[PDB]
Design an enzyme around this catalytic site. Structure first.
Site, PDB file in Angstrom:
ATOM      1  N   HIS A 210      15.305 -32.339 -26.633  1.00 39.80           N
ATOM      2  CA  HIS A 210      14.021 -33.022 -26.773  1.00 39.80           C
ATOM      3  C   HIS A 210      13.125 -32.973 -27.938  1.00 39.80           C
ATOM      4  O   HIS A 210      13.066 -31.800 -28.240  1.00 39.80           O
ATOM      5  CB  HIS A 210      13.003 -32.715 -25.580  1.00 39.80           C
ATOM      6  CG  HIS A 210      11.907 -33.618 -25.442  1.00 39.80           C
ATOM      7  ND1 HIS A 210      12.052 -35.002 -25.291  1.00 39.80           N
ATOM      8  CD2 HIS A 210      10.449 -33.394 -25.422  1.00 39.80           C
ATOM      9  CE1 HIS A 210      10.991 -35.670 -25.093  1.00 39.80           C
ATOM     10  NE2 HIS A 210      10.017 -34.652 -25.425  1.00 39.80           N
TER      11      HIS A 210
ATOM     12  N   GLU B 240      17.752 -35.305 -23.168  1.00 42.98           N
ATOM     13  CA  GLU B 240      16.450 -35.262 -23.054  1.00 42.98           C
ATOM     14  C   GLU B 240      15.886 -34.053 -21.857  1.00 42.98           C
ATOM     15  O   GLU B 240      14.598 -33.598 -22.207  1.00 42.98           O
ATOM     16  CB  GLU B 240      15.734 -36.544 -22.326  1.00 42.98           C
ATOM     17  CG  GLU B 240      15.882 -37.673 -23.468  1.00 42.98           C
ATOM     18  CD  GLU B 240      14.743 -37.554 -24.372  1.00 42.98           C
ATOM     19  OE1 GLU B 240      14.158 -36.368 -24.330  1.00 42.98           O
ATOM     20  OE2 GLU B 240      14.735 -38.343 -25.254  1.00 42.98           O
TER      21      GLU B 240
ATOM     22  N   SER C 122       7.574 -37.906 -27.579  1.00 43.06           N
ATOM     23  CA  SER C 122       6.981 -37.376 -26.311  1.00 43.06           C
ATOM     24  C   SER C 122       5.556 -37.951 -25.932  1.00 43.06           C
ATOM     25  O   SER C 122       5.466 -39.355 -26.197  1.00 43.06           O
ATOM     26  CB  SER C 122       6.607 -35.875 -26.739  1.00 43.06           C
ATOM     27  OG  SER C 122       7.577 -35.350 -26.086  1.00 43.06           O
TER      28      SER C 122
END
Ligand SMILES: Nc1c2c(nc3cc(Cl)ccc13)C[C@H]1C=C(CCCCn3cc(CO)nn3)C[C@@H]2C1
Ligand SMILES: Nc1c2c(nc3cc(Cl)ccc13)C[C@H]1C=C(CCCCn3cc(CO)nn3)C[C@@H]2C1
Ligand SMILES: CC(=O)N[C@@H]1[C@@H](O)[C@H](O)[C@@H](CO)O[C@H]1O
Ligand SMILES: [Cl-]
Ligand SMILES: [Cl-]
Ligand SMILES: [Cl-]
Lengths: 540, 540
Positions: free
Chosen positions: A444, A331, A200
Site C-alpha cells: 500500500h 493492497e 488512501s
C-alpha cells in the site's frame, strides 16, 4: 533579493527558496498559512481564513505536522520510518506548499494538488515521497500540497453541534482548495485547470470533494490512488461518531463526574485537554478488534455529505467529470503485518488455517459468522485448504480486496455508469530499493514515489528503467491533469489507455513492460464484495 | 433340455434360454418370480417371498414392467424412447433376470446386481441398454437385474402405518438381493462376492443398501453411477411423504368424499383405485415448480433408513467397503430440456439472463431469494454476464452440480473419511450414435450402454474405438467386482486409477484417451453446495 523567489498573495508577501532538482531549478513556497491556527477554543471547529499579515513571510521550510499518533511498529526501520512525521507535531499546522518551475511559467499552467493519506489519523504533506520538485521541473506543473487536521482534531464529531460538527479535516482541505482559486495565478498556475490527487485517505478525501457540492467548483479533474469515499473504512454514521466522541471524552476528563447535559459543556472540557491526551485514547474507541478501521474519519452528517457515499455514487450526475483511479498489486500486505497474528517482515509469514480464520474476523470485523464463512469459502483453495503460502496470500487479498480493490471497482463502475470518463490502472512494479520482504509484493502506497518522480534524483539509487518508468507515470498524470486523458495527445504506438466502462471493464497494467490493457478488475470477487456480501451482512 | 438351461432353485425348477452374444452363446434366465405378486390387498405392502411352485417354470422371456408414468417429451424420438417400458405395464411385476456364460461357469463367478434408475418413478430391467449378455459372454460375469415397484406402488407412504409403511420398492430390491444369496450358486455365481451397481435412482438405491444393515449383509461392494442416497431428491421426510400421500388420496376421491380418516381407511380406499388412476395423479402432489424432484421416493422412516442419509454417511464405519462412484460430463442438460423454459433439443438453446435467473429458481426450488442469489453469484461470469452460450452451460451446471456431481463428491469424501476404499470417475465420451444435440454433451444415463458393452454388437454401428472403449470399461467394472480395485492386476503402465482420498481427491476421466488422473472433483463449487449453501438456506 531574487525577484522570482518573492510573491504577493491576497494575505501579503512571501519569500520562497530556490531548489535544485537534478535537471535544473524550481521555486518552492513552503509553509504558507491558509488558516488561523485551529487551537485553543478553535479546537474541533471549522477552519477560518488566515488573517492578513504584514511584512515578508518566510516560506522556505516545511511547517509543523498536524498533531497525530505515531506508529511504533518497527522502531528503527526505514520502511516504516520514511512515513513518520518529519517536523514537530503541533495543533498549529494549517499550512500549504507550492512548487512552480524556475522561472515562473510561460502562461497559466495546469495545477496538481496532493492530499496525503494515512487512515485520517496520520500524515504530512512535508514527506520525502510527496516532494513536488520533479513534477514541476520535469513537466512544468504547479504542484500544491496541504496539511489538514487528522484524528480527533480533524474528525471527532458530536453531530449537530455548533462546536464539534465533524469533517473539519475536510474543511481544512476545502480551504486550501479555495486558497488555490484565489492565489495560484500569482505563482503561474491556472485556477481553471485544477486536478486533485491523493492516496488512501487522500483518495477518499478527493472522493469526498467529488461528492460534496461546495467543493465541486474548486477543481476540474480527480485522481483516486488506492482509496475511495465509498467502502468500509472511510466514513462512519452520525450515531457511531457520537458514540466514539462521547466515549473518547469520558476516558479523558469529560464532562467531569458523569454529567451529560450540554454538548458544548462536553466540548469545552475537551478543549482543555492536552493534545497528547486525546491521541493517547484514540484507539480505545473502536468497536472490535480490527485492521483497516480508524476511530475518527469523515461522518455522514447530512451536511458535508448529504447522504452516504454509496447513495451518492449511485444517484449522482457525473457528465463533466474525468477521473483516474487505481490500486497497487498488494493492497493488503502491510495491514497483515500491522495487526493480524502470524504475519511479520522478519519471517516470511506462512500461517496455519486457524490463523487464516482468525485473520478473517479481524479483517472483516463487521461480519457475522455466516458472512465470515462466505469469505472463507471464496478465498479458500478447497483442493489445498492448508497450503500456508496460499493462506498467506489469500489473507492479504481478503483485506486488500475488501478495503481497496473492490471499492475502487465499485467506484469506477458507478461513475462510468453515470456519465463520467474514467481511466483505471493497477500498479504492479516493485522498487529495487524497497526493504519490505518479497512476500509483501507492491504494498500500500509504494507507487507514490514513482508518480512523484523520485527515481529521477540519481543519488537515490533507482535503476535506469525505474527512471524511465517514473517519467512515463509523470507524463500520464500530468497529461491527465491537462486534458482529462492520460494518453500522449499525438503518439505513434504505445498503446492507448482506454476508458474503463461498465460494458468492457478495461484497465491498464502499470509496470516496467509497456502498457498492457486488461479486462475485469477482480470481477468475480468484486461481485462477491459489492453485491452479495452486503445482502448477507444485513439479514444475519 | 440342456443340463445348462435347466436349474432348480429353492422355489422350484426353471428353464432358461441360450442366447447369441457376438463372441459366442450365453445362458439367460428371464422372468423369475422373486415375490408374490404385490396386487390387490398387497398394494403398498412390503413384498412377500414367492411361494414354491411345481413343474418347470418357463424363464425364457422378460416379464411385465412395474406400473409407471410414461414420459412423452418427444413422442416418436429415438433418444427418449429407448428409455420407455418395452413390455406391458402390470402390478404383477416382481421378477428378476440372470445371465451367465454358456456353459454355466465351472468356478464360482463374481455376481453383478444391476438396479435401474428412473427418478423412483420409472425404469425396467428389460431395457435394451441393461442387457447382461455382453458382460456375461465377454467377462464371464453372472449378471442379475430385478424389477422393483416405482412411483406410488413403490414409495407411497403413510409413515407409521401398517398398510403403507413406505420404502416398499427398496424392500423389493432387498428381497431380490436375498434371492441372490439363496440361489445364485445354482447358476454358477459366487454369493461370497456380490457387487451392486446402478445409475441415477438405481445409484441412490445402491447407497441406501450400504446404509441399511439388513441390506449390507447381502453384498460386498457397490458402484454408484450418477446418483446418491444423500442429496436433494433421493429422499423425503416422513412429514412430506404423509402430506403427498394424503393429497394424492384426496385427488382421486379418497377420503371417500368426506374427511381424512384412519390411515387404514384411506389406504383401503386407494387400494380400490385402478393402477392407471394412481399413475395419472402422481405429479399432482409436488409442492413447487421444480426439476429433478420426484413425488414418491424413499422416505426417512426410522426403519429402513434409521436416520437421514446425510447423518448416516457422516457417522458410519465403512472400513470393510469398496465403492466406485462417478458422474457423466453433462448431468444437467436433459433436465433443462425436460423442465426449464428456454431449452430444447431442436436448437442450440442460447438463453437470456432473465431465463438463467428463472432457471435457478426451478433448479433450486427450496432456495430463498438470497440463497438463489448466491447460486447466481457463483455461476455468472461477471465479465460477460449476458453471454448466452455461457448462461446455457451455467444453467446446466447448476442443475448437474446441485443434484448429482456435488452430492457424489460429498459421498466420496465422507466414505473415504470413514474408511472405505473409494474410486471416482468422470465419464466424458459422447456416443458416436447419440441423437440428442451437441450442446447437451454427454447427458445423464449415456454411459450405461458403454458399461454394459452394447458397442460390441456390430449391428449397432458404434465405431471401432467405441468397441475398444467398451472393452476397457467392462474390465474396469468387472475388475472392481472381482477384487474391489478396478485396475488390471497382472499388468502395469495403463495408467493406474488411484483411490479417491480426502487429502488428494484423485479421480480419473473415462474417454477414448487413456486414463488421465485429475484432482478435486469440482472442488470449489462443491464446497459451495455442500458446506455453505445449507447454512445459507437454513438461515434464510
Ligand atoms: N505508514 C504507511 C503509509 C502508507 N503505506 C505504508 C506501507 C507500509 Cl509497507 C508501511 C507503512 C505505510 C500509505 C498511506 C496510508 C497509511 C495508512 C496506514 C494504516 C495502518 N493501519 C492502522 C490500522 C488500525 O488498526 N489499520 N491499519 C499510512 C501511510 C500513508
Ligand atoms: N428417460 C431418461 C432416463 C435417463 N436418462 C435420460 C437422458 C435423456 Cl437425454 C433422455 C431421457 C432419459 C437415465 C435414467 C434416469 C431417469 C430419470 C429422469 C428424470 C427426468 N425428470 C423429471 C423430472 C420432473 O420434474 N425431473 N427430472 C429416466 C431414464 C433412466
Ligand atoms: C452563554 C450561553 O449561550 N450558554 C451557556 C450554556 O451552554 C452553559 O452550559 C452555561 C454556563 O457554563 O450557561 C450558559
Ligand atoms: Cl486479462
Ligand atoms: Cl436375441
Ligand atoms: Cl425386444
Amino acid at each position: 533579493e531574487d525577484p522570482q523567489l518573492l510573491v504577493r498573495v491576497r494575505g501579503g508577501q512571501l519569500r520562497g527558496i530556490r531548489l535544485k532538482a537534478p535537471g535544473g531549478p524550481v521555486s518552492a513556497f513552503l509553509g504558507i498559512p491558509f488558516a488561523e491556527p485551529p487551537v485553543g477554543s478553535r479546537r474541533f471547529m471549522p477552519p477560518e481564513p488566515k488573517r492578513p499579515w504584514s511584512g515578508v513571510l518566510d516560506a522556505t521550510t516545511f511547517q509543523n505536522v498536524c498533531y497525530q499518533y505515531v506508529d511504533t511498529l518497527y522502531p528503527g526501520f526505514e520502511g516504516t520510518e520514511m512515513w513518520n512525521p518529519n517536523r514537530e507535531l503541533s495543533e498549529d499546522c494549517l499550512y500549504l506548499n507550492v512548487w512552480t518551475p524556475y522561472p515562473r511559467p510561460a502562461s497559466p499552467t495546469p495545477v496538481l494538488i496532493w492530499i496525503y493519506g494515512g487512515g485520517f489519523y496520520s500524515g504530512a504533506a512535508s514527506l520525502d515521497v510527496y516532494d513536488g520538485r520533479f513534477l514541476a521541473q520535469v513537466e512544468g506543473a504547479v504542484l500544491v500540497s496541504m496539511n489538514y487536521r487528522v484524528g480527533t482534531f480533524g474528525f471527532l464529531a458530536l453531530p449537530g453541534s455548533r462546536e464539534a460538527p465533524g469533517n473539519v479535516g475536510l474543511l481544512d482541505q476545502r480551504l486550501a482548495l479555495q486558497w488555490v482559486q484565489e492565489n495560484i495565478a500569482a505563482f503561474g498556475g491556472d485556477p481553471m485547470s485544477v486536478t486533485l490527487f491523493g492516496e488512501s485517505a487522500g483518495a477518499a478525501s478527493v472522493g469526498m470533494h467529488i461528492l460534496s457540492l461546495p467543493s465541486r467548483s474548486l477543481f476540474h479533474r480527480a485522481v483516486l490512488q488506492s482509496g475511495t469515499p465509498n467502502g468500509p473504512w472511510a466514513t462512519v454514521s452520525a450515531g457511531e461518531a457520537r458514540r466514539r466522541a462521547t466515549l473518547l471524552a469520558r476516558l479523558v476528563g469529560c464532562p467531569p463526574g458523569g454529567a451529560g447535559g450540554n454538548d458544548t459543556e462536553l466540548i469545552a472540557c475537551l478543549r482543555t485537554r492536552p493534545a497528547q491526551d486525546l491521541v493517547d485514547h484514540e484507539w480505545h474507541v473502536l468497536p472490535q478488534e480490527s485492521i483497516f478501521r480508524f476511530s475518527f474519519v469523515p461522518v455522514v452528517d447530512g451536511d458535508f455529505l448529504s447522504d452516504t457515499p454509496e447513495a451518492l455514487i449511485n444517484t449522482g450526475d457525473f457528465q463533466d467529470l474525468q477521473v483516474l483511479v487505481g490500486v497497487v498489486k498488494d493492497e493488503g500486505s502491510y495491514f497483515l503485518v500491522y495487526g493480524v497474528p502470524g504475519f511479520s517482515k522478519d519471517n516470511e509469514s506462512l500461517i496455519s488455517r486457524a490463523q487464516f480464520l482468525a485473520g478473517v474476523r479481524i479483517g472483516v470485523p463487521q461480519a457475522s459468522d455466516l458472512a465470515a464463512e462466505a469469505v472463507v469459502l471464496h478465498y479458500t483453495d478447497w483442493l489445498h485448504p492448508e497450503d500456508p503460502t496460499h493462506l498467506r496470500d489469500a489473507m492479504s487479498a481478503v483485506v486488500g480486496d475488501h478495503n481497496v480493490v473492490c471499492p475502487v471497482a465499485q467506484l469506477a463502475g458507478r461513475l462510468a455508469a453515470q456519465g463520467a470518463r474514467v481511466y483505471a490502472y493497477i500498479f504492479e512494479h516493485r522498487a529495487s530499493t524497497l526493504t519490505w520482504p518479497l512476500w509483501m509484493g507492491v504494498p500500500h502506497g509504494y507507487e507514490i514515489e514513482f508518480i512523484f518522480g523520485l527515481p529521477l534524483d540519481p543519488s537515490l539509487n533507482y535503476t535506469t528503467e525505474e527512471r524511465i518508468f517514473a517519467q512515463r507515470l509523470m507524463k500520464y498524470w500530468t497529461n491527465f491533469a491537462r486534458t482529462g486523458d492520460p494518453n500522449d495527445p499525438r503518439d505513434s504506438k504505445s498503446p492507448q489507455w482506454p476508458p474503463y466502462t461498465t460494458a468492457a471493464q478495461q484497465y491498464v497494467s502499470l509496470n516496467l513492460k509497456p502498457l498492457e490493457v486488461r479486462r475485469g478488475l477482480r470481477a468475480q470477487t468484486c461481485a462477491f464484495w459489492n453485491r452479495f456480501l452486503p445482502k448477507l451482512l444485513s439479514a444475519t
